[PDB]
Amino acid sequence: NHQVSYFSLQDVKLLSSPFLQAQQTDLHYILALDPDRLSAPFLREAGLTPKAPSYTNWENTGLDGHIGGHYLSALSMMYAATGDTAIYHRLNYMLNELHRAQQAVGTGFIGGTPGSLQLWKEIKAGDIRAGGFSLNGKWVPLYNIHKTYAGLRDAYLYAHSDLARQMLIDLTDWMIDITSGLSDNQMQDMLRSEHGGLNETFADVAEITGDKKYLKLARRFSHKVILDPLIKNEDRLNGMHANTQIPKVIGYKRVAEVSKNDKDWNHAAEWDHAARFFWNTVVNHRSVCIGGNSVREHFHPSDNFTSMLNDVQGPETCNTYNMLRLTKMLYQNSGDVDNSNKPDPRYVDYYERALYNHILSSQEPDKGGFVYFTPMRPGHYRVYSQPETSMWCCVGSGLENHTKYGEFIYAHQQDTLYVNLFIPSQLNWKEQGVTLTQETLFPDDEKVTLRIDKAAKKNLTLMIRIPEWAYEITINGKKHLSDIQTGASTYLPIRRKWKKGDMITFHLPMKVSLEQIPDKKDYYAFLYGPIVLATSTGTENLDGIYADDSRGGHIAHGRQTPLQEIPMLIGNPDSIRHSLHKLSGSKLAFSYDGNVYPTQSLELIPFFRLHNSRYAVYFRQASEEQFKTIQEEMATAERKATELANRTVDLIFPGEQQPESDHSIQYEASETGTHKDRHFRRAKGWFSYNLKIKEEASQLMITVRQEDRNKAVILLNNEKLTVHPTVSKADKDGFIRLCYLLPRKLKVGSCEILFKPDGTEWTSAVYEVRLLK
Numbered sequence: 001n002h003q004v005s006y007f008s009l010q011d012v013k014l015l016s017s018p019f020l021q022a023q024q025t026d027l028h029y030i031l032a033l034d035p036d037r038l039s040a041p042f043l044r045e046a047g048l049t050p051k052a053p054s055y056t057n058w059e060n061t062g063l064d065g066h067i068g069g070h071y072l073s074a075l076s077m078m079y080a081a082t083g084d085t086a087i088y089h090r091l092n093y094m095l096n097e098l099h100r101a102q103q104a105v106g107t108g109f110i111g112g113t114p115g116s117l118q119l120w121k122e123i124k125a126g127d128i129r130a131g132g133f134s135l136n137g138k139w140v141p142l143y144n145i146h147k148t149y150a151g152l153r154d155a156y157l158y159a160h161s162d163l164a165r166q167m168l169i170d171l172t173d174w175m176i177d178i179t180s181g182l183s184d185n186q187m188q189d190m191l192r193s194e195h196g197g198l199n200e201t202f203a204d205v206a207e208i209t210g211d212k213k214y215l216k217l218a219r220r221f222s223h224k225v226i227l228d229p230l231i232k233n234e235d236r237l238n239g240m241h242a243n244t245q246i247p248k249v250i251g252y253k254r255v256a257e258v259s260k261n262d263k264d265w266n267h268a269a270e271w272d273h274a275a276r277f278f279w280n281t282v283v284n285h286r287s288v289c290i291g292g293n294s295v296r297e298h299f300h301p302s303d304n305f306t307s308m309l310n311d312v313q314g315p316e317t318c319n320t321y322n323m324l325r326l327t328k329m330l331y332q333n334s335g336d337v338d339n340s341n342k343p344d345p346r347y348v349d350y351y352e353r354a355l356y357n358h359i360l361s362s363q364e365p366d367k368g369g370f371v372y373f374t375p376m377r378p379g380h381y382r383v384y385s386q387p388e389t390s391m392w393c394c395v396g397s398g399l400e401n402h403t404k405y406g407e408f409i410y411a412h413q414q415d416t417l418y419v420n421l422f423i424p425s426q427l428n429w430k431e432q433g434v435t436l437t438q439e440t441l442f443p444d445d446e447k448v449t450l451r452i453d454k455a456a457k458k459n460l461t462l463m464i465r466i467p468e469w470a471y472e473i474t475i476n477g478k479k480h481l482s483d484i485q486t487g488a489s490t491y492l493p494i495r496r497k498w499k500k501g502d503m504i505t506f507h508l509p510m511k512v513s514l515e516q517i518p519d520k521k522d523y524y525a526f527l528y529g530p531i532v533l534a535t536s537t538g539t540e541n542l543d544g545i546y547a548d549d550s551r552g553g554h555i556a557h558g559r560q561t562p563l564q565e566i567p568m569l570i571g572n573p574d575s576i577r578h579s580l581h582k583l584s585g586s587k588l589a590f591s592y593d594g595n596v597y598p599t600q601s602l603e604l605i606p607f608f609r610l611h612n613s614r615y616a617v618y619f620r621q622a623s624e625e626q627f628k629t630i631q632e633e634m635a636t637a638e639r640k641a642t643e644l645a646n647r648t649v650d651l652i653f654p655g656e657q658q659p660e661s662d663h664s665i666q667y668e669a670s671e672t673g674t675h676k677d678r679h680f681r682r683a684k685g686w687f688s689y690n691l692k693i694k695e696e697a698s699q700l701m702i703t704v705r706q707e708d709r710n711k712a713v714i715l716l717n718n719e720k721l722t723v724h725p726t727v728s729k730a731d732k733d734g735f736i737r738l739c740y741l742l743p744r745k746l747k748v749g750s751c752e753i754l755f756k757p758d759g760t761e762w763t764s765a766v767y768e769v770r771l772l773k
């Protein structure tokens with residue numbers, strides 16, 4: 001009787017704000033893409049003639065088709081949000097091209113993976129050769145086809161396309177046939193390969209059709225090794241690839257939702273709970289101040305953020321896009337699950353933190369371009385995509401992000417409206433005969449006004465979110481005072497027979513806070529209200545800040561600044577917090593007026609506004625007592641680590657999917673794993689990469705474990721490396737570096753590196769491959 005609903009994008013008009021800017025910039029980027037290049041893989045796999053070459057980058061190195069899927073979703077949501085005619089022409093054309101591809105094969109299959117029909121013939125026969133990122137020699141093909149399922153779902157739900165609906169059902173029936181001869185054990189083996197959110201999309205088809213066969217399919221596509229610990233409130237996520245898991249959990253939640261009234265299956269509450277526990281553990285233990293998670297795409301231990309503070313590959317944007325999708329699902333029925341009948345605004349505090357500080361920051365606001373990694377290492381920078389060069393996962397999610405800022409501003413519950421986000425907007429609440437405008441300069445000002453533009457004098461309750469970070473309201477010039485009931489996130493209820501012209505005004509008091517890195521190392525970020533602040537540390541060596549189509553072009557490969565050159569805050573955390581002063585002006589800006597080492601007064605602005613520069617979000621802190629020892633470590637060990645990084649020509653992390661894929665991983669009889677938080681690969685046959693040599697290289701460094709008795713032969717362009725390596729002292733965790741001084745410098749270009757056993761059963765387990773000048 002008390003279900004909470006969301007509004008359609010059609011019903012929520014963004015008014016001038018950073019969000020409308022971001023929407024419009026993404027519109028331009030979406031329209032820049034050539035649909036004939038995005039459709040080319042699909043036509044190819046159907047036996048038709050493409051009209052143009054595919055894009056390059058990931059669209060011709062094995063993930064061919066994935067951006068086309070995202071492109072359907074982004075066009076559909078952007079069309080719902082704007083009604084843009086150019087967007088509709090592109091969406092109609094892409095749907096009709098993919099429909100031609102589907103009809104040419106006639107089975108329901110649509111896809112771009114090279115050799116798609118052969119792949120799925122093998123799978124259907126039970127020839128399943130799964131790795132974490134591969135299936136039968138192909139790059140995450142389940143993940144790829146997921147973006148088509150999702151794209152066709154979105155064309156139906158957002159753009160009302162019946163053609164998309166039929167294409168989606170045919171493609172789902174095709175998968176029923178592919179999996180009809182597979183045991184649950186074979187399915188769970190195949191699901192070891194990254195598969196995006198297929199369980200979610202199959203549950204979506206169940207709801208669209210009302211046919212439970214699609215819910216049985218969704219459950220078959222639910223990865224049990226991940227689900228089962230979550231049911232039991234066990235976080236087993238250390239070392240896992242993070243964006244692989246989040247869509248699975250979204251899927252468990254969606255299966256639970258669509259299964260709410262399924263008399264033949266009794267697990268909905270358990271699967272809902274698994275998702276709510278997953279959210280809790282990631283948000284509360286694995287997330288930084290901007291709302292993101294992971295380092296080099298993987299979950300590190302929650303008690304050790306060292307790599308988050310040292311690596312240039314900070315949180316990945318996809319992961320936050322997916323955590324926000326989950327957040328929206330969990331919030332909707334939070335009141336049903338806790339039998340309060342009011343949803344839990346703690347979900348909204350997270351949503352706001354991640355939306356303003358990560359999603360909004362992840363697009364260059366003027367020109368466009370999407371961020372993959374956001375370093376938390378002080379003094380680095382982030383790289384942006386370009387429309388015709390960049391075909392990354394974070395481009396696909398990037399296209400979607402800025403279409404849909406209207407989706408979570410408000411929620412409705414019969415005669416109740418939840419005012420969740422303080423984003424300028426006009427709402428059509430047709431269910432209660434109301435049109436309302438939210439006017440605010442937030443976060444640059446504290447005042448919010450809600451204006452009733454149209455109403456039918458129903459008694460309605462406005463539930464205004466009072467964030468934990470933030471009671472007098474004004475109605476029509478009259479002050480109404482209410483008692484604070486909790487310092488926690490809560491709602492302030494205001495019920496009236498609203499009429500045209502009524503005005504509700506409230507203020508959100510904003511304070512400076514200082515948020516420590518979660519493992520309580522000596523690094524802190526400044527916030528103002530929910531806004532993460534940052535300082536610009538310079539504009540030198542921003543190499544590849546607008547990416548080309550190269551493998552690895554999503555990473556900020558420019559020079560690493562030694563930490564002793566970046567401002568370090570001297571003193572205790574309360575003194576440091578008190579030393580940040582707000583500057584006068586209509587935009588947020590702050591001066592840091594305490595002691596900084598080395599001296600440059602620092603200016604801080606919102607991180608979402610900091611572009612085309614190096615930055616610090618987290619600052620290293622030093623007590624006056626520990627300064628001498630801290631500075632000596634920064635001047636010696638940290639400086640030397642930075643020098644090694646700055647002599648590095650190429651770098652591979654064996655066992656990490658994207659580093660391996662960017663270096664054209666090949667293998668025979670190989671396995672991967674983790675030891676002491678580091679990934680490896682080893683083989684009984686062999687494994688190989690291509691090294692990309694931008695500058696001549698002199699030295700190869702291989703990281704292994706001292707205790708490993710297995711040895712590798714190394715071939716460079718099929719010539720055995722016979723020079724004797726120098727061997728480093730073992731570190732704390734038992735890792736050593738083998739340093740080979742190459743007999744001849746390696747030429748600029750590409751060089752195969754191949755590892756095969758040297759008399760032993762396996763190669764050494766290799767944890768890092770580094771090429772140096």
Ligand SMILES: *[C@H]1[C@H](O)[C@H](O)[C@@H](O)[C@@H]1CO
Nearest residue numbers: 243244318393394657658
């Ligand atoms: C980016 C994102 O993490 C996706 O899940 C993955 O397939 C891609 C590269 O690893």
Ligand SMILES: [Zn+2]
Nearest residue numbers: 316318393394
């Ligand atoms: Zn990504």
